[PDB]
Amino acid sequence: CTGLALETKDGLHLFGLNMDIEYSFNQSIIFIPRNFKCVNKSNKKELTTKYAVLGMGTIFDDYPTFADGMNEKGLGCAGLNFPVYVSYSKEDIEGKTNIPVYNFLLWVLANFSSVEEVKEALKNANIVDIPISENIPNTTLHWMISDITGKSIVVEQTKEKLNVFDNNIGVLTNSPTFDWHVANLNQYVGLRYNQVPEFKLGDQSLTALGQGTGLVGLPGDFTPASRFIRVAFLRDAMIKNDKDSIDLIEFFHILNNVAMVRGSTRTVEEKSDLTQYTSCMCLEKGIYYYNTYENNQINAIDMNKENLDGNEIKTYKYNKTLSINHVN
Amino acid sequence: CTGLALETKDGLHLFGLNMDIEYSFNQSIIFIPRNFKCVNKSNKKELTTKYAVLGMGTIFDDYPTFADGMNEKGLGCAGLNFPVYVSYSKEDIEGKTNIPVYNFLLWVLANFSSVEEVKEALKNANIVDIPISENIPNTTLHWMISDITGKSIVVEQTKEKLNVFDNNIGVLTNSPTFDWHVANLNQYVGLRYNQVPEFKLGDQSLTALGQGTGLVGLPGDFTPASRFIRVAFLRDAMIKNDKDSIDLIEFFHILNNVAMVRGSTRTVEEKSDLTQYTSCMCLEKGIYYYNTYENNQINAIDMNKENLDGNEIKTYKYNKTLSINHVN
Amino acid sequence: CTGLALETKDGLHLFGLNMDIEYSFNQSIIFIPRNFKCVNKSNKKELTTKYAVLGMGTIFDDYPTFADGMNEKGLGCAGLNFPVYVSYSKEDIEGKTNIPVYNFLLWVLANFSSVEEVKEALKNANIVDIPISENIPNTTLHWMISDITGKSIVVEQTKEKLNVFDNNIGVLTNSPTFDWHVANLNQYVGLRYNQVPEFKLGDQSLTALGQGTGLVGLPGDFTPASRFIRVAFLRDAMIKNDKDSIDLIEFFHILNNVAMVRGSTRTVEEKSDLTQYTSCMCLEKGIYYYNTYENNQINAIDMNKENLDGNEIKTYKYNKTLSINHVN
Amino acid sequence: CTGLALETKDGLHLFGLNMDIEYSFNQSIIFIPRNFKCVNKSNKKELTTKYAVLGMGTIFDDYPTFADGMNEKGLGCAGLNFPVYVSYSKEDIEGKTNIPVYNFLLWVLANFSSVEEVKEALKNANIVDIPISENIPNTTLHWMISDITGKSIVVEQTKEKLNVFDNNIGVLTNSPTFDWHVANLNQYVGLRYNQVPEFKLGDQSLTALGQGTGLVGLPGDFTPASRFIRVAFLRDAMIKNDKDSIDLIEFFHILNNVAMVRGSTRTVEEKSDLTQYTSCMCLEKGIYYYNTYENNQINAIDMNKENLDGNEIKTYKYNKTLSINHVN
């Protein structure tokens, strides 16, 4: 997966991700009104939302769980794969706020209005490997959290501790740890967005064959480290050169560059890993935008079109039917 | 620019390109019925279409010129930038079929029903640097031509001759010459679409950090050579692994990977080179599909919805208004 | 700099480095007998060697300091540049063994017979930024230590603590931290030492143009991370495929691949960074082998040809005069 | 193989190559006086030298054949592998100067005093696939020829014709064709020899981790194309920055960077491809310098120490015994 935070020319804050996986997880878009009692029938535990929530997820026995989402206050959160380097506790740790892996997304969005509130709450938190149901194990995750201040954080639990990083890059992918990727960025200080039209190689004149010679050296594969580098620099270039032009579609242009394509990222089980969907949350507006591998048209669900004091969880069907404008 | 030919699971042939440029060229989609007299008011020359034509282009003084297009017989043609290595004659060459650069697209689509017909006609052809108007110079181009047989050719005029290559790769970009790119493909025989999960480095166990380790080495920049490699291999992987799943959207997924993003491909004049539009012609069906940098929704113009024996050139406005599905 | 540990076919252990710098540091090879009182006239501190020492260094006011060296017990140590991530204490830390940066090399070799002894001693150690003379500041260093057991460690002081890593890779370069490079190795699990002679790209047959197609993707520049990857894999390939052939010259073949070449690694002060010298210590034999940028012939200083109970420090002039065998 | 031509600070011209192969070819250094009748006992053909010759080769039934060599006039020639793209005639072509593949080296050095003379002679030449003995087939070769003027040419026979290229790069490797590599150089116009110390990534400061950030993007593998790029740029940097320092050892520093290392370039027959030897001919002086994988000390054979009007071919044994300077 690849997460991205981007500010538009109008001062609006976009946040979302490419969700890159080789299967459907039975997903739908899910809306939860404020003051709603989410009931986990498995362990008879409950969570009452303080804030209305909207995001992509799945419902297990009437209990909502999210992959990524936002709330009415303009807080966004997304979970991304984090293999090898993650470490969850086997059981609750006495004295800590213990949050089961699958519930972390909802725990953030239901409870807190800002990155600052989340940061404070995470100081004494611990992520625990208790699953939603014993036959549905948790996956290995880390999270990116972002809000209307334009600040983002990265949350990674290692065996050492629950790390909370300020994210000044605007991006997240997968393993290794976040500090590893930040240090990796230093390898690419030689990249240039500006054309290099020629090079005098002594008695041989060299000429650029086309645009783009300044970025030769940028990695083109789909591994987490390469995707991180590409999005970090594509984002930086757009902000440097085109701050006053940034709008919703630009978010998709950036992520499309690191989206997986059917056939070329094959798992050991011979399945194609794809960018299943790409979400873009407009935090100020409470609009969850998304498209899918099958249907590239952007769909918009606006939580403000719902009754935020409603008494039902609402869902919207994941759109996988290509939407074409028939001009004539 | 990046051209692509791809066959769908239903045996339909798609052909089109990313048109990558730093400006608008006043483009519209243009339809010309069959038996239509295209009149060039500049030199009082004419061309009467044998076949109905549909494509992207511009009209100068009522005379249509195309960047890319198709005809009613399922023949497609696209022009792509070809700097440095191109050579056009300064004037007509006695004994040859002389075709002005700007008119080549229309000359192909108006006259011929197939790649095979085109190939024969090009044996004695010469591309001449006579412009549409003395103040509108020609640009440096090469062309990809493809039809319902699934065969594609590449047309490149050098100082040596007018080269016509069989294109077994399914792709075209820009300079160097086509044979150069074909030889460049050999550098990448070590690429693997299948995950490499681990490597035993003597006393150190190495583990894949995420999917995609088989393609490490794929170039990630936006130069013509790198784009050619990426599309060639993305296309090959999809055909190898997912032949029976290939549909219209897959064409866009492939090209999106090599699409330029605002800000990061800056010209010496400090303009951003972008993928302005992406066309996809369904050759059997006479449908010209396209989207744009501004509006990613696919738009469809179907020439068969027109009177092919009509008496007017028809145009359709280039769509740059983002089209969103408002779900709720 | 690039450090390397390698075992020969005869079970001998080689350890040394490319010393990559843009200037001379007034170096000579320095031999110190055992039970010798090294006197620092600056601070009137002393160090009496337990073991005889041989290595490359410089003498300040009769006090020896080393860049790299070995002792009579078969322990080797080398210091390599470690900018940005290093942190030394400003003064002694109460309760710790405090070792001034410049003295660390000698402190290791003078005192300890093995990696195991060193590891124990470092548990309560701290590296302090006290210079040899107030006008000769310390440099930013980390160290590799290795012995006749074939075990190697890496010593890095950060602001967090004095880290001691087991080094199962057999190599060290410069920043980032050692764990960063170990994680970076995972990016390259797709590398193959075995030729890939062909690739069937659908209707296009691709053929290897020469040997080496399996390693396409290996980085070719001279940065610390790239040098680390190259040496790690060159070393691994040689052990995997040619364990029973490894001899002294192989050590130089590996390091030559990452050696800097005059002209192409230019500093901001417009000086060429070069591999000034390459050392190779045969730990069991007490032989310090080295060559230089100017003279590539390997020179051997054997500490066992000296009186290990001698009463003088001895030096040997750094050889920069190309040595040619005139055959006829 | 990798060929290199380089001029020293004293205006002397060096020319030679890394000979990269997975086996011994029974080589020795061979000297032939002038006016010497070389007799091929196989076909009873002869060649009388006009000029004295010195180089690496093998003698079949008293007939000398060379891999690389020089003559008394300061002309040098080397043969390098050229698979796939080479085409030799099956028999003599009427009206041409027909030169058997294996004899080309000697034909150049025995007959001609300069590149200019060679160029003229090649206008009507054809390389023929007639072997030295029916059980010793020719190999696929192209050649680099260079002289005391500092001019170099590349000779490649394709099915189209015998191509003679001016070589303004100073280097040669293997396939593809020479013009292909020249065009490939254009991909690397973005390389910089000068350090890039930092990059401001918006709210993240990026810092160079070590020297060499300007060359990130340089390919590090051992394929012909990658070796060509590396040597071309290493050579260019040294001439640009250090023209007045270039001496004999610099030639070896450049080639060492592209030398194959045992274990990591494995053939399909599971043999290690190595840089067997590296030659460096000082053209003005008639000195053939070389070292080997086993013995890195440079050995010098000076043809001017021989009687150039002698009556015997003379040989010198290929030195594979590591030569060490025992300092103490």
Q: List the chains bordering chain D where 3 or more Cβ pairs fall under 8 Å.
A: A, B, C
Element (H, E) at B228: helix B224-242
Q: Contact, D277 vs D289, CB < 8 A? A: no
Counting beta carbons within 10 angstroms of the beta carbon of residue A244, is it exposed (0 to 12), middle (13 to 18) or buried (19 or more)? exposed
Query: What was the experiment behind these coordinates?
Result: X-ray
**Is the residue at C270 inside a domain?**
yes
**Is position D1 annotated as part of the catalytic site?**
yes
The alpha carbon of residue B284 is apart from the nearest alpha carbon of chain C, in Å, by 22
Taking an 8 Å cut-off on Cβ atoms, the answer to whether B218 and A223 are in contact is: no
Is the CB of residue A223 less than 8 Å from the CB of residue B216? yes
CA distance B15 to C152: 58
B164 has which bridge partners? B155
- Among B222, B254, B296, the residue with its CB nearest the CB of A215 is B222
Q: What is the C-alpha to C-alpha distance for residues A243 and A9, in angstroms, rounded to an integer? A: 6
Active site residues of C: 1
Measured between beta carbons, the chain A residues lying within 8 angstroms of D197 are 189
**CB-CB: which of B175, B214, B327 is closest to A209?**
B175
Closest CA to A121 of A97, A105, A141: A97
**Cα of C205 to nearest chain D Cα, Å:** 13
Give the residue numbers in B contacting D (CB under 8 Å), as ranges: 176, 180, 183-184, 186-187, 223, 225
Distance from CA of B183 to the nearest CA of D (A): 7
Domain span holding position D231:
2-318
Suggest the residue from D209, D228, D271 to mutate for an interface test with chain C (most C CBs closer than 10 A).
Answer: D209
For residue B237, list chain C residues with Cβ-Cβ distance below 8 A. none
Residue D250 domain flag: yes
In this complex, the residue of D233, D264, D306 whose CB is nearest that of residue C215 is: D264
How many whole angstroms separate alpha carbon C268 and alpha carbon D196? 8
**DSSP H or E stretch at residue C238:** helix C224-242
Q: Assign residue A96 the CATH number of its domain.
A: 3.60.60.10
Q: What distance in Å separates the CA atoms of residue A170 and residue A15, rounded to the nearest whole number? A: 9
- Residue A326 domain-assigned (yes or no): no
Contacts of A191 in chain D (CB under 8 A): 199, 216
**Cα-trace Rg, chain A:** 21
Beta bridge partners of B2: B18
| H or E segment and range at residue A98 | strand A97-100
Neighbouring chains of C at 3+ CB pairs within 8 Å? A, B, D
CB contact under 8 A, B268 and A195: yes
* Catalytic residue IDs of A: 1
C-alpha distances out from residue C20 to C25, C156, C157, D59, Å? 12, 19, 21, 43
In chain C, what residues touch D266 (CB-CB under 8 Å)?
193-195, 214, 237, 241
Please state, in angstroms and rounded to a whole number, the distance separating the CA atoms of residues A279 and A292. Answer: 9
Task: Report the residue of chain C nearest B189, measured CA to CA.
Answer: C199
The phi, psi pair for A230, rounded to 5°, reads -60, -50
Closest CA of chain B from C171, distance in Å: 12
**Distance of alpha carbon C1 from alpha carbon D159, whole angstroms:** 48
Q: Which of C183, C223, C225 sits opposite A176 (nearest CB)?
A: C183
HEC string of chain A equals CEEEEEECCCCCEEEEEEEEECCCCCCEEEEECCCCEEEECCCCEEEECCCCEEEEEEEECCEEEEEEEEECCCCEEEEEECCCCCCCECCCCCCCEEEEHHHHHHHHHHHCCCHHHHHHHHCCEEEECCCCECCECCCCEEEEEECCCCCEEEEEECCCCEEEEECCCCEECCCCCHHHHHHHHHHHCCCCCECCCEEEECCEEEECCCCCHHHCCCECCCCHHHHHHHHHHHHHHHHHHHHHHCCHHHHHHHHHCCCCCCCCCECCCCCECEEEEEEEEECCCCEEEEEECCCCCCEEEEHHHCCCCCCCCEEEECCCCCCCEECC
How many Å apart are CA B319 and CA C5, to the nearest integer? 63
Subunits that touch chain A (at least 3 Cβ pairs < 8 angstroms)?
B, C, D
Q: What share of chain B is helix, strand, coil (3-state, %, to 5)?
A: 20, 35, 45
User: Do residues B69 and B287 touch, judged by C-beta distance below 8 A?
Assistant: no
Residues 6+ apart with CB under 8 A from A43: none
Residue in C186, C203, C216 closest to B206 by CB: C186
Instruction: Classify residue B324: in a domain, yes or no.
Output: no
Which residues from C are below 8 Å from A when comparing CB atoms? 176, 180, 183-184, 186-187, 223, 225
Distance in angstroms (rounded) separating the CA atoms of residues C256 and C241: 19
| Å between D316 CA and nearest CA of chain C | 8
- Separation CA D227–CA D214 (nearest Å): 18
The SS3 assignment for D309 reads: coil
Q: What is the distance between the alpha carbons of residues A104 and A140, in angstroms, rounded to a whole number?
A: 12
Six token digits for residue C3: 């450090």
Distance from CA of C80 to the nearest CA of B (A): 22
Q: Which residue of C has its CA nearest to B214?
A: C190
Tell if the CB–CB gap between B216 and C214 is shorter than 8 Å.
no
**Counting one residue from A and one from B, how many pairs have CB atoms under 8 Å apart?**
275
Q: Which of B183, B188, B232 comes nearest C216 by C-beta?
A: B188
Q: Using the beta-carbon criterion (under 8 Å), do C272 and D81 form an inter-chain contact?
A: no
Q: Which of D176, D186, D223 sits opposite B183 (nearest CB)?
A: D176
CA distance to partner chain C, nearest, from residue B199 (Å): 5
Minimal Cα–Cα distance from D103 to chain C, Å? 24
Tell me whether residue A82 is in a domain.
yes
Residue by residue, DSSP assigns B4-62 as EEEE-TTS-EEEEEEEEESS----EEEEE-TT-EEEETTTTEEEE-SS-EEEEEEEETT
User: Which chains form contacts with chain B, at 3 or more CB pairs under 8 Å?
Assistant: A, C, D
Contacts of D180 in chain B (CB under 8 A): 180, 183
Resolution in A: 1.8
- CB nearest D216 (choices: A170, A207, A217): A217
- Are C128 and C89 in contact by the 8 Å Cβ rule? The answer is yes
The sign of the dihedral angle between the CA atoms of A132, A133, A134, A140 is negative
Instruction: Find where tokens 């460049």 sit.
Output: B184
- Give which of B139, B206, B211, B321 to mutate to test A binding, by max A Cβ within 10 Å: B211
Using DSSP, state whether D219 is helix, strand or coil.
Answer: strand
Q: Which residue has the tokens 């000698």?
A: C106
Contacts of D176 in chain B (CB under 8 A): 183, 186
**B201, C236: Cβ pair inside 8 Å?**
yes
d(CA D80, CA D141): 5
Token output for A50: 């303080």
For an interface test with C, the pick among B149, B193, B206 (most C C-beta atoms closer than 10 Å) comes out as B206
CA distance A185 to D98: 58
| C-beta of residue C252 within 8 angstroms of C-beta of residue C4 | no
Closest CA to A54 of A43, A77, A70: A70
Cα→Cα distances C26→B123, B291, C42, C109, Å: 72, 67, 19, 21
Best mutation target, B192, B204, B231, to test chain C (most C CBs within 10 A): B204
With respect to residue D43, please indicate whether it lies within any of the assigned structural domains.
Answer: yes
CB contact under 8 A, A223 and C180: no
DSSP string, B70-113: EETTS-EEEEEE-TTT---BSSPPTTSEEEEGGGHHHHHHHH-S
- For D62-113, give the DSSP string: TEEEEEEEEETTS-EEEEEE-TTT---BSSPPTTSEEEEGGGHHHHHHHH-S
Query: A224 is written with which tokens?
Result: 């987490």
The total number of structural domains in chain B stands at: 1
Contacts of C225 in chain A (CB under 8 A): 187
* C304-C305-C308-C314 Cα dihedral, nearest 10 degrees: -120
**Interface contacts (B, D; CB < 8 Å):** 12
- Give the position of tokens 């066992």: C304
Helix (H, G, I), strand (E, B) or coil at D38: strand
- Chain A hits for D191, Cβ within 8 Å: 199, 216
- Pairwise CA distance, residues A188 & D206, whole Å: 9
Q: Tokens 């090469």 label which residue?
A: B142
Distance CA C178, CA C226 (A): 14
* B88, B50 contact by CB (below 8 A): no
Contact B184 D184 (CB under 8 A): yes
Cα distances from D152 to residues D143, D192, D235, D257, in angstroms, run 10, 26, 15, 22
